[PDB]
Amino acid sequence: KSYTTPKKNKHKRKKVKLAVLKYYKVDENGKISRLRRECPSDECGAGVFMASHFDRHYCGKCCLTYCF
Amino acid sequence: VRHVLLRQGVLGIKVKIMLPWDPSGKIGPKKPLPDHVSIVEPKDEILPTTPISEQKG
Amino acid sequence: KEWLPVTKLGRLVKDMKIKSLEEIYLFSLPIKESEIIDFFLGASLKDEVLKIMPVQKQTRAGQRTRFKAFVAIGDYNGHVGLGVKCSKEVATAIRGAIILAKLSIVPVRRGYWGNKIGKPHTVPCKVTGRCGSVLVRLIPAPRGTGIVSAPVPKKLLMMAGIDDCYTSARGCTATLGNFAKATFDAISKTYSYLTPDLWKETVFTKSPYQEFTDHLVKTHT
RNA sequence: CCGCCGGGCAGCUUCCGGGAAACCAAAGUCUUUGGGUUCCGGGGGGAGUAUGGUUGCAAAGCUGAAACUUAAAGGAAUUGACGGAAGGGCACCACCAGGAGUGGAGCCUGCGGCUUAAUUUGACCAACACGGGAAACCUCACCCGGCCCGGACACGGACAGGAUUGACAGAUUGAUAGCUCUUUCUCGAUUCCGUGGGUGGUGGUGCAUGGCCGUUCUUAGUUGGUGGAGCGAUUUGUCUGGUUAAUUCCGAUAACGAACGAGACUCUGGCAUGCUAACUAGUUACGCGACCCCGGUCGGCGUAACUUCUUAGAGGGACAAGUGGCGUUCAGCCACCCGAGAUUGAGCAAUAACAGGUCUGUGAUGCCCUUAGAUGUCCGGGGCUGCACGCGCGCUACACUGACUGGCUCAGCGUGUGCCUACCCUACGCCGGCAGGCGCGGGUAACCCGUUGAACCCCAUUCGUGAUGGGGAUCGGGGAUUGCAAUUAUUCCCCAUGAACGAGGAAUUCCCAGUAAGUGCGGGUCAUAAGCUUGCGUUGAUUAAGUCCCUGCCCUUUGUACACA
Ligand SMILES: [Mg+2]
Ligand SMILES: [Mg+2]
Ligand SMILES: [Mg+2]
Ligand SMILES: [Mg+2]
Ligand SMILES: [Mg+2]
Ligand SMILES: [Mg+2]
Ligand SMILES: [Mg+2]
Ligand SMILES: [Mg+2]
Ligand SMILES: [Mg+2]
Ligand SMILES: [Mg+2]
Ligand SMILES: [Mg+2]
Ligand SMILES: [Mg+2]
Ligand SMILES: [Mg+2]
Ligand SMILES: [Mg+2]
Ligand SMILES: [Mg+2]
Ligand SMILES: [Mg+2]
Ligand SMILES: [Mg+2]
Ligand SMILES: [Mg+2]
Ligand SMILES: [Mg+2]
Ligand SMILES: [Mg+2]
Ligand SMILES: [Zn+2]
Numbered sequence: 038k039s040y041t042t043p044k045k046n047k048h049k050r051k052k053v054k055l056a057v058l059k060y061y062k063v064d065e066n067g068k069i070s071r072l073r074r075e076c077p078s079d080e081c082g083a084g085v086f087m088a089s090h091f092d093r094h095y096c097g098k099c100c101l102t103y104c105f
Numbered sequence: 106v107r108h109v110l111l112r113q114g115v116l117g118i119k120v121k122i123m124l125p126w127d128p129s130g131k132i133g134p135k136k137p138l139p140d141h142v143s144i145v146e147p148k149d150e151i152l153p154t155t156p157i158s159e160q161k162g
Numbered sequence: 163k164e165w166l167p168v169t170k171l172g173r174l175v176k177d178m179k180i181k182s183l184e185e186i187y188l189f190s191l192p193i194k195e196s197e198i199i200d201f202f203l204g205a206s207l208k209d210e211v212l213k214i215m216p217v218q219k220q221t222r223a224g225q226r227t228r229f230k231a232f233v234a235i236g237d238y239n240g241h242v243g244l245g246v247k248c249s250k251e252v253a254t255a256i257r258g259a260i261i262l263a264k265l266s267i268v269p270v271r272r273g274y275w276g277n278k279i280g281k282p283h284t285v286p287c288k289v290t291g292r293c294g295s296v297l298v299r300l301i302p303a304p305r306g307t308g309i310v311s312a313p314v315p316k317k318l319l320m321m322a323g324i325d326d327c328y329t330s331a332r333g334c335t336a337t338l339g340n341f342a343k344a345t346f347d348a349i350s351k352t353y354s355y356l357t358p359d360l361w362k363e364t365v366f367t368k369s370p371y372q373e374f375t376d377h378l379v380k381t382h383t
Numbered sequence: 384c385c386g387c388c389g390g391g392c393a394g395c396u397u398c399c400g401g402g403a404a405a406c407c408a409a410a411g412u413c414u415u416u417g418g419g420u421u422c423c424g425g426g427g428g429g430a431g432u433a434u435g436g437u438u439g440c441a442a443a444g445c446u447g448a449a450a451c452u453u454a455a456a457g458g459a460a461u462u463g464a465c466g467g468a469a470g471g472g473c474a475c476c477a478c479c480a481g482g483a484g485u486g487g488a489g490c491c492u493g494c495g496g497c498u499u500a501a502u503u504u505g506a507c508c509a510a511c512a513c514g515g516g517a518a519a520c521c522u523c524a525c526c527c528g529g530c531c532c533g534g535a536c537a538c539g540g541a542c543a544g545g546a547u548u549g550a551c552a553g554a555u556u557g558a559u560a561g562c563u564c565u566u567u568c569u570c571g572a573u574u575c576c577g578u579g580g581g582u583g584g585u586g587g588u589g590c591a592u593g594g595c596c597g598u599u600c601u602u603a604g605u606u607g608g609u610g611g612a613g614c615g616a617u618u619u620g621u622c623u624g625g626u627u628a629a630u631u632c633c634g635a636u637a638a639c640g641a642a643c644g645a646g647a648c649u650c651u652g653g654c655a656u657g658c659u660a661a662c663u664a665g666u667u668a669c670g671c672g673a674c675c676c677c678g679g680u681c682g683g684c685g686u687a688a689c690u691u692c693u694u695a696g697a698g699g700g701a702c703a704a705g706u707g708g709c710g711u712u713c714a715g716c717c718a719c720c721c722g723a724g725a726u727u728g729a730g731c732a733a734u735a736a737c738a739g740g741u742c743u744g745u746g747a748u749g750c751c752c753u754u755a756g757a758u759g760u761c762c763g764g765g766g767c768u769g770c771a772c773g774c775g776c777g778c779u780a781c782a783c784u785g786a787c788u789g790g791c792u793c794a795g796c797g798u799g800u801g802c803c804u805a806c807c808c809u810a811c812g813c814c815g816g817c818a819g820g821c822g823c824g825g826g827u828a829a830c831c832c833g834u835u836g837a838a839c840c841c842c843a844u845u846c847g848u849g850a851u852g853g854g855g856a857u858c859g860g861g862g863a864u865u866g867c868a869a870u871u872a873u874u875c876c877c878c879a880u881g882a883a884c885g886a887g888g889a890a891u892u893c894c895c896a897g898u899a900a901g902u903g904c905g906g907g908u909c910a911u912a913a914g915c916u917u918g919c920g921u922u923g924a925u926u927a928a929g930u931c932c933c934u935g936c937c938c939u940u941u942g943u944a945c946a947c948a
Contacts, residue, residue, distance in 0.1 A: 038750085040583070042757035044534045050574055051547035058544090059567090073568080088568035093552055097569030102551045108593060114749050117593040140647045194609090217616055220463045220946070223599070223736035230616090248616095250607085290414060294614040295403055299414055332414080334403085340614055355415095 060086050076101070165197045170371065172198055173382055179374050187269050189369055199243075199264040206237040209260055210317060213338050214252055232342055233259035236267065236321040243267035244318065244346035246339060268346070270322045271353040275302045283326050286357055291348030294340030296333035300348050303328045314338060315345035322349050 060073045074087045078099045087103070088095035094103035109116040124133035126141075137143070167173045172195040174180050183202045186193065193199070200207055212232035219226045229252040236242035245263030249255035273286030284302040291298040298315055307326040309319045312335065319327055335341045371378070 038582095038584080038586095039752060040757090040759075041586085041753035042759080043754040044532070045755050047532065047534080047575065048549090049547055050570085050572070051545050052542050052572095053547095054543075054545035056545060056568090086568070088550090088566065090550085090567045091564085092554095092566050094566060095551070095568065097550065100550060100569085104552060106594070108747055110748075112749080114591065115593045115747065117747095138647085219461080219617070220948090221735065222463070223734095225946095226462090226735075246615095288415075292614095296614090297414065330414080337615085343614075 059089070074103075167195060167197070169194055170378060171195075173378065174370060174374055175201055177377065177381060179377065180370055183267075184269065185367075185370065188367070191370070193265055193267075196261040196264045199267055203237055203241065203267075206239075207235055207264070208237065208321065209233055209235045209263075210321070211256055211259075212314060212317070212342055214255075215339065217248065229255050230339075231255040231259040232339060233263050234318050234321065234342065234346075235260060235263040236318075237323075238321055239323045240270050240272070241267045242270060242318055242322045242346060242349055244343050246343070268350040269353060270324065270349055271355075271357075272322070272324050273302075273357075275304055280305075283324075285324055285327055285349075285352055287355055289348045289352050289355060291344040291346065291351070293344045293347055294334070294337060296331060296335050296337070296340045296344045298341070298344040298348050299330045299332075300324075300345075300352075301328035301330070312341070314342050318342065318345050318349065324349070 060071055062070050062072055071086075073089060074094070075083060076085045076087055076096045076099070078085060078096070078101065080099060085096065085098055088097055093105065096102070106117070106119050109118060126137055127133050128135065165172075165176060167176055171180075171186060171191055171193070175186075175198050180186065183198065186198075210233065212234055215230045215232065216227055217230050218228065228248050228250055230246065230248035231252065233245045233247075233256060234242065235245070243263035243266045245259040245261070245266060247255050247259035247262055249258060271286055272282045272284060274280075274282055275284050283305050285300045287302065289300045291300075300319070303310075303326045305326060307328070309316050309324065309327050309329065311319060311327070311329040312331065315329055315331070319329070331341070333340075
């Protein structure tokens with residue numbers, strides 16, 4: 038009826054952007070390099086980028102990992 | 106036997122209706138009550154006091 | 163819905179051969195049907211529920227409560243009845259008390275105090291009513307005194323139309339049933355008192371049962 | 384002997400009348416209040432107490448307060464309840480005659496207690512093998528840790544210049560939970576951060592409730608309408624008597640007509656050589672086939688009749704009908720013939736109720752609880768099983784009326800492949816001593832398991848009165864089966880181990896005809912599975928056809944200072 042242990046957060050989505058700032062680099066002219074490494078995945082060849090989290094290496098959607 | 110919800114509590118209602126007897130069976134039941142002997146009343150005919158015949162054809 | 167009458171006096175009064183209930187009071191016939199009274203008096207006959215009294219007998223499992231209602235009815239000119247009815251629920255006790263009170267309307271003699279100008283106002287003499295232990299004494303009064311009483315004989319006298327009266331009660335008047343039907347007994351025997359203007363020896367009239375004995379052969383057997 | 388008169392104790396009857404009523408020819412002639420006159424009461428207690436007077440030899444008597452305390456004390460009558468009050472009757476939840484026992488022993492299970500992180504909890508005749516409560520996980524509520532949100536919606540923040548969804552590494556953890564710390568990737572308006580506000584609980588409260596059940600209460604009891612009595616609560620009907628299992632009837636009668644309960648009913652048990660019919664049941668004949676010395680056996684094969692057996696529908700049948708007694712000669716009872724039965728057994732079952740049980744059956748539920756650090760839910764582990772003790776329900780026993788080992792020969796209830804649901808009943812053939820394992824098959828079922836080849840029983844062996852071949856508790860080891868997982872042995876098997884127990888103290892439970900009891904087989908529980916419970920057959924008695932003595936129940940009368948009785 039009337040509850041004992043009450044709610045905290047759920048598991049969130051996300052607002053402070055242009056997260057693409059930190060994968061691509063340009064100069065003032067036609068020069069397009071990339072900060073972060075590209076996924077060799079079979080489902081997506083060149084679109085999906087690998088990861089920057091918190092120690093090592095990884096990618097997210099097919100979740101395939103690169104380490105030392 | 107059905108419930109009523111209230112602000113104060115819960116109420117219960119039993120409605121029990123004894124249906125009347127009918128030969129049709131669309132209003133109530135077909136069978137009479139097992140202790141209801143309904144005799145038929147005799148139609149009244151006179152006894153004849155002289156033997157008479159009924160020839161014809 | 164219609165009133166199919168059972169008794170003989172009721173058959174006459176719905177066949178409209180009795181002019182008013184004063185002649186069935188004259189012959190003192192037993193009224194045992196309630197429709198007679200709100201036939202002659204149904205316009206102005208008012209009711210009061212004096213009290214709802216919950217008596218209870220005691221059975222094997224618990225206590226068997228039955229409500230007993232007191233209903234005093236009467237038009238405000240010359241008639242009162244007092245009905246007492248015990249039943250399981252208060253509504254049907256009240257309805258049965260109304261039909262007993264209509265059954266037991268008794269006509270009210272009321273007369274004067276001193277000089278006899280006008281329309282009568284008090285009881286004709288000093289009368290008493292006793293039942294249980296309570297004695298209720300009704301006394302003539304000058305005009306405009308009002309009824310001086312308790313609320314219950316106050317209300318039965320004012321619906322008798324005794325619009326002024328001096329009352330004195332003795333006994334255990336707290337018991338409402340005895341106090342009410344004692345008051346009704348005093349109002350009732352106002353006519354049974356023998357007053358000196360009633361010494362003309364009575365020219366006896368035809369009885370209703372005798373005067374309409376051919377109609378009472380024809381219209382039902 | 385029959386009257387009359389006066390007064391005397393009385394009585395009966397009565398709508399004189401009176402009274403709160405019991406009642407009373409006075410307790411009447413009282414509010415319609417007055418014949419005459421003494422004595423005396425003023426709520427209940429304190430109290431006929433103290434003190435004073437007076438009397439007495441004394442005990443004591445007459446006069447006789449107050450302080451103080453108290454909301455009732457009391458009278459008459461009604462209805463219940465109660466009675467170690469009476470009169471009738473009734474029941475193996477009572478007794479008698481008995482039978483099987485229980486209580487004694489081991490063990491199974493529930494309960495109190497003890498112990499513990501927890502050993503959750505409901506209930507103490509009418510709780511205690513009850514919650515369909517036989518819990519390894521789930522159940523699960525309890526305990527110890529860890530995830531998730533399963534914050535709907537609205538308002539305002541910050542806001543496709545992305546609040547961080549999910550996340551293998553590696554630390555941490557129990558866990559390959561990204562739960563959280565050290566590359567911030569993929570995802571792309573779902574949503575959060577405050578704010579209100581819902582939602583969920585096997586949390587509390589059955590003493591807020593419904594519903595359902597149990598019980599008072601398995602007995603015969605209960606209530607209106609009108610009429611009678613009484614001021615009234617109430618009573619009458621609903622009863623003297625007989626009779627019945629029965630407030631069941633005959634019948635009496637200020638009651639008449641009615642309703643519920645009993646009965647009636649419904650299912651079941653029993654009887655049909657008459658009906659209806661049967662390749663999902665059979666019988667008999669017939670023809671083959673097998674066997675034995677024309678015949679006999681065959682659940683061997685196939686079909687010409689029939690429905691006795693079996694299935695199951697309509698009917699039928701038994702009604703105290705008939706006879707002899709008993710009784711108002713009514714209601715009915717007893718006996719006997721005829722006969723399948725001359726009381727089979729159950730289900731439903733009233734008015735009024737208990738603060739009986741259930742919020743732990745529910746999305747039936749009022750109110751209250753607690754505002755991440757779950758009493759929601761999920762997962763991992765434990766516990767619900769813990770053992771100095773006491774109790775209840777039960778199983779096995781204490782042997783020869785037996786055990787063991789062969790052999791022989793008989794049932795009826797039923798159930799069976801699932802919505803999720805992934806787990807069914809199993810014949811037959813191989814392997815293994817058993818537990819079981821492996822193959823192919825039948826069955827959504829009168830088809831297959833299945834002619835259900837069940838036990839006890841019966842027959843034949845061994846045992847020999849010895850805690851013995853009774854008993855099988857406890858306990859070591861090994862093998863199987865279900866399961867994600869068996870340790871606190873889940874269950875089954877094999878071997879070995881062999882406790883108490885010599886018929887149970889006071890006390891006590893159930894029962895009377897296919898009944899008690901012995902004996903196994905089905906259902907529920909169930910993945911595994913019955914020492915329970917619900918059903919079922921099988922073998923089948925002793926005693927009794929009665930009583931109120933005990934325990935209680937019903938009706939009448941009477942008594943009450945009882946009425947949470
Ligand atoms: Mg006086
Ligand atoms: Mg006094
Ligand atoms: Mg009293
Ligand atoms: Mg008996
Ligand atoms: Mg005995
Ligand atoms: Mg014991
Ligand atoms: Mg024992
Ligand atoms: Mg178990
Ligand atoms: Mg568990
Ligand atoms: Mg758990
Ligand atoms: Mg709930
Ligand atoms: Mg209760
Ligand atoms: Mg209670
Ligand atoms: Mg609190
Ligand atoms: Mg338990
Ligand atoms: Mg042995
Ligand atoms: Mg031995
Ligand atoms: Mg007993
Ligand atoms: Mg059980
Ligand atoms: Mg006495
Ligand atoms: Zn990738």
